[PDB]
Design an enzyme around this catalytic site. Structure first.
Site, mmCIF file in Angstrom:
data_model
loop_
_atom_site.group_PDB
_atom_site.id
_atom_site.type_symbol
_atom_site.label_atom_id
_atom_site.label_comp_id
_atom_site.label_asym_id
_atom_site.label_seq_id
_atom_site.Cartn_x
_atom_site.Cartn_y
_atom_site.Cartn_z
ATOM 1 N N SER A 1 0.922 -1.226 -0.056
ATOM 2 C CA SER A 1 0.016 0.003 -0.144
ATOM 3 C C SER A 1 0.856 1.272 0.000
ATOM 4 C CB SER A 1 -1.158 0.095 1.045
ATOM 5 O OG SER A 1 -2.239 -0.951 0.685
ATOM 6 N N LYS B 1 0.301 3.905 -2.757
ATOM 7 C CA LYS B 1 -0.952 4.992 -2.655
ATOM 8 C C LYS B 1 -0.479 6.464 -2.466
ATOM 9 C CE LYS B 1 -4.079 1.214 -1.524
ATOM 10 N NZ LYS B 1 -4.484 0.318 -0.418
ATOM 11 N N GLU C 1 -5.757 -3.309 -6.997
ATOM 12 C CA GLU C 1 -6.020 -3.790 -5.917
ATOM 13 C C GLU C 1 -7.237 -4.791 -5.810
ATOM 14 O OE1 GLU C 1 -4.406 -3.642 -3.066
ATOM 15 O OE2 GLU C 1 -3.474 -1.753 -2.594
ATOM 16 N N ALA D 1 1.290 -3.797 4.225
ATOM 17 C CA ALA D 1 1.227 -5.001 4.813
ATOM 18 C C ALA D 1 0.819 -6.014 3.643
ATOM 19 C CB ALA D 1 0.499 -5.166 6.098
#
Ligand SMILES: [Ca+2]
EC number: 3.5.2.6
Length: 258
Positions: free
Chosen positions: A45, A48, A141, A207
């Site tokens: 992530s 982003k 995603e 993660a």
């Protein structure tokens, strides 16, 4: 209490897999310390923040507006959409979608924003366009999580420095980006848990189920960021609790030796 590089190496000994770290001075761009700086790690992530850099670059160019409202439907939702699943009737503006993508790691917010620029390969093209020929996003995603969707510590750190201090974005857009990272809601067990009273920190974590953890951050004492830190770990069979703890202890070491 041990020097930071010792602690990083220890963390890798305890966890297996690999740990990559870099500390960069924000003003000069000098590398202060590093470990596996040129090896690849999954971004997770942390991408982003790069994605909303590309959206704010469109806004600076007059091709996008943060207040533009996007409506979407139940069909567009993917796993881990805690803010976007609550706005099926009212939609979210592009600015809200970036806030959700950065501060909550909302996965449908990130997918919607990727649609606005034409998909993952177009994010990679924006990175190439700014001089980062290493970092690549290939996936949407939730399935980032081989060399797909990876960066290196020094590529990510340099790229983050260019976004935060460069003249690639306008001053207002650079401030908006660090404001969203300062409001991060989901990184409390990582660097935040080792920060003394009165320090500034702006960050984004990642993660995977799955073996991997990372954080990117700009931090410094007296309400001002002065260093960028990037930590990535991949490849171990350790628990989430163990990976979070090692990051918080590397964080404690870099503060005690600042
Ligand atoms: Ca080792």
């Amino acid at each position: 209490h041990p020097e930071t590089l010792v602690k990083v190496k220890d963390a890798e000994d305890q966890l297996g897999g690999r740990v990559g770290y870099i500390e960069l001075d924000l003003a000069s761009g000098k590398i202060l310390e590093s470990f596996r700086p040129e090896e690849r790690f999954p971004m997770m992530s942390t991408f982003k923040v790069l994605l909303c850099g590309a959206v704010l670059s469109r806004v600076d160019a007059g091709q996008e507006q943060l207040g533009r409202r996007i409506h979407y439907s139940q069909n567009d939702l993917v796993e881990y959409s805690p803010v976007t699943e609550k706005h099926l009737t009212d939609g979210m503006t592009v600015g809200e979608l970036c806030s959700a993508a950065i501060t909550m790691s909302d996965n449908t917010a990130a997918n919607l924003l990727l649609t606005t620029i034409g998909g993952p390969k177009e994010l990679t093209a924006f990175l190439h366009n700014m001089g980062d020929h290493v970092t690549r996003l290939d996936s949407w995603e939730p399935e980032l999580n081989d060399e797909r969707d990876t960066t290196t510590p020094v590529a990510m750190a340099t790229t983050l420095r260019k976004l935060l201090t460069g003249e690639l974005l306008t001053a207002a857009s650079r401030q908006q980006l660090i404001d969203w990272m300062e409001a991060d809601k989901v990184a409390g067990p990582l660097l935040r848990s080792a920060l003394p009273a009165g320090w500034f920190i702006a960050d984004k974590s990642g993660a995977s189920e799955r073996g991997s953890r990372g954080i990117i951050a700009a931090l410094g004492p007296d309400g001002k960021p002065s260093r960028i830190v990037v930590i990535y770990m991949t490849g171990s069979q350790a628990t989430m609790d163990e990976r979070n703890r090692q990051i918080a202890e590397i964080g404690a070491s870099l503060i005690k030796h600042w």
